[PDB]
Amino acid sequence: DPRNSGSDCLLSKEQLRSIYESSLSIGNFASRLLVHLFPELFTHENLRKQYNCSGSLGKKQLDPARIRLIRHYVQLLYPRAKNDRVWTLEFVGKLDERCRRR
Known part of the structure; x- marks a missing residue:
């Protein structure tokens, strides 16, 4: 994405394939990206909650x-997932759960 040009947090193609290949589903993939991109929320303080x-x-x-x-x-x-209903119904819930879980 050219919009993201100059960003310092992007993942390479080989990296994305790695992370996906070690995930158990596309939703799990999204959760691991969540934990990776919001590290300040997944410490022992659990600000994610x-x-x-x-x-x-x-x-x-x-x-x-x-x-x-x-x-x-x-x-x-x-x-x-470019469709907003798919993203809402099939991903937002799993991300909110990853934030919320015990």
Whole structure:
């Protein structure tokens, strides 16, 4: 994505294939990207528990730029994730769960 030109946090193609090949599903892939791109939320302080993707249900919103990057990487493997209903119904829930879980 040319929009991301100059960013310092992008993943190479070989890296993306590695991470996907060691994941158990496209949703799991998205969760591991979540934990990788928001490291300050997955420490022993578990700040992740205050967040979800939308800022719904009284939670704070996860950075939309990094979520946009995760959806971009997912769309590379799952083009139907370019559809907003697919992204909402098949990914946002799993990301919110990764933020929320015990």
